[PDB]
Design a protein around this ligand. Sequence first.
Ligand SMILES: *OP(*)([O])(=O)O[C][C]1O[C](N2[C]=C([C])C(=O)[N]C2=O)[C][C]1N=[N+]=[N-]
Ligand SMILES: *OP(*)([O])(=O)O[C][C]1O[C](N2[C]=C([C])C(=O)[N]C2=O)[C][C]1N=[N+]=[N-]
Ligand SMILES: [Mg+2]
Ligand SMILES: [Mg+2]
Ligand SMILES: [Mg+2]
Ligand SMILES: [Mg+2]
Lengths: 194, 194
Amino acid sequence: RALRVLVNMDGVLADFEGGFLRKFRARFPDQPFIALEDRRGFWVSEQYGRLRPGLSEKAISIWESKNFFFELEPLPGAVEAVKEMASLQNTDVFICTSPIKMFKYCPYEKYAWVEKYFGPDFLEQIVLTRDKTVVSADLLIDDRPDITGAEPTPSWEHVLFTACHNQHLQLQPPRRRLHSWADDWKAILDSKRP
Amino acid sequence: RALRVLVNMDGVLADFEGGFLRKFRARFPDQPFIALEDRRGFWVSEQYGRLRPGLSEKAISIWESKNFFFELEPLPGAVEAVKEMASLQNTDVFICTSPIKMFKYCPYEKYAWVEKYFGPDFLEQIVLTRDKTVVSADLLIDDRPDITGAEPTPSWEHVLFTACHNQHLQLQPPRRRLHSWADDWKAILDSKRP
Ligand SMILES: *OP(*)([O])(=O)O[C][C]1O[C](N2[C]=C([C])C(=O)[N]C2=O)[C][C]1N=[N+]=[N-]
Ligand SMILES: *OP(*)([O])(=O)O[C][C]1O[C](N2[C]=C([C])C(=O)[N]C2=O)[C][C]1N=[N+]=[N-]
Ligand SMILES: [Mg+2]
Ligand SMILES: [Mg+2]
Ligand SMILES: [Mg+2]
Ligand SMILES: [Mg+2]
């Protein structure tokens, strides 16, 4: 009866693409890289793997490093928008994020990042899961085009959040985008209310 | 269409109650303690708080310490039962656990513990969340008597897993218990299948 909205973290709240590129270039200044305008497909490591053998493993080593997740910059408007959204009447917001395989730093730093930008009281709103389809909600705002898992008919509508890797993608109607946090996210939420 | 079962971690897979008591007694050998047969109510810290002022904070310091979660022993039969359950046809198992407030070690060690006892491939089955009601499934096996959150009508049936703190509790019918992993968990699952 409160509208429930799942908001993804990497590529929606946290600038994974830009943080990765900067750190990759700083660590591997003699390697070729992929400019953001040229990113295609969800998996960074796969595109880097195509660019030259060995580069996939080098890419992976950036996000496996300590402080990678913690030092991500918020995307413009993201912190303000989610704080406003959570404050709305009849609206519950959860941050729904999928950790990487190597778990030494990533879960911890994701909690630390949410504490930093949203405060201790928001920590209760975090859901860490590899499968978003088993999380029930009205909406999922997420930059990954294809979201699948154990539940063949998730309860949420997936609204595709624009990112460099999906900006050229034609979606199957009636699939819907949120173009950035400057875009009219309130209209999207309202479209789902009784 | 596959049956989905959420299995709680602390007090269902991992022996939180026994690990806590042992470590509390080792660290604070001059303090009064609560024998397991005398545990009542979900919150350890609250019962310890009643036993004497200051003891709540001492209790908390045990599970906030590094290696507390990682060093928990599995409950008897738990690892074998969950491995068998996951291997069943038309049956998906997720481990659904709620981290403590202090997040330095707990998320990380929970992943490390699941890797230790269930293997790397099981890490994909973990859901960390403070709110279990937003996780959709057929069953939730969990030792906490009262499970509430943002979803007033969760999709799962909650089957109460016996623990020292709930063993005397009379439940409102048609609520159901799993008494230990030696008990007939297959019968409970089968009762929910088409
Ligand atoms: O779907 P979600 O929650 O945004 O992110 C999942 C997770 O994928 C990891 N990743 C990302 C890329 C681009 C890649 O090539 N390889 C990966 O393993 C990082 C991302 N966030 N985290 N943790
Ligand atoms: O409900 P769940 O997933 O088993 O555990 C929640 C979480 O509560 C923490 N806890 C437990 C007691 C008994 C207490 O007094 N105070 C707490 O903060 C530990 C438990 N597991 N974890 N992380
Ligand atoms: Mg994302
Ligand atoms: Mg609200
Ligand atoms: Mg429990
Ligand atoms: Mg199975």
